Each structure stands twice: as structure tokens, then as C-alpha cells.
């Protein structure tokens, strides 16, 4: 269960990994095969926003829907 304080103290090089491990299973529940791709897309967003998404299903849904729209337009 991730706070901003715990994430920011981790080495910048492992922060995205910590967020990914938490985001991927949440996304996989919506998109069972596209979860890795969508997670990769979302990981480019600021960590502050990503932390909010982990705690708020509605914010995560809206970002996932945005990634899927983008993928739909690229084949």
C-alpha cells in the first residue's frame, strides 16, 4: 500500500517498477491481454498522478480508457 513518501524515498530507478507491479494487475482485470502495453503507456505519467490512480478506481478507469482510445486509433 503505497504512499508518496515511501515512493519518493526509493531510488528514482526503482520507482516506476514499484508503480508497475501495482498497476499491472489492476489493469489486467479490465484488459487481460493488453495490460502490459497499457501499463507501459501509463508509466510515462507523473508519479503523483499514478499514486492517485492506484487509490481511486474511477481515475484509473479514465486513464485506461484514454490509453485504449489511443491504441484503437493505431490499429
Amino acid at each position: 500500500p503505497l504512499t508518496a513518501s515511501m515512493l519518493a524515498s526509493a531510488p528514482p530507478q526503482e520507482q516506476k517498477q514499484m508503480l508497475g507491479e501495482r498497476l499491472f494487475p489492476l489493469i489486467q482485470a479490465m484488459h487481460p491481454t493488453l495490460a502490459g502495453k497499457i501499463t507501459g503507456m501509463l508509466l510515462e505519467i507523473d508519479n503523483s498522478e499514478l499514486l492517485h490512480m492506484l487509490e481511486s478506481p474511477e481515475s484509473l478507469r479514465s486513464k485506461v480508457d484514454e490509453a485504449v482510445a489511443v491504441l484503437q486509433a493505431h490499429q
Binding site: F24, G36, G40, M41, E66, A67, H74
Partner: peptide, 15 residues
Amino acid sequence: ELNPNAEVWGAPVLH
């Protein structure tokens, strides 16, 4: 804006 070319996260490296 999100990037459609962002890499697949968590894909295992095997042969």
C-alpha cells in the same frame, strides 16, 4: 498525452 509506442511493461525475457 499518452504514447502508443510506449514499451510493454512486465514482459518476461526468455528464449
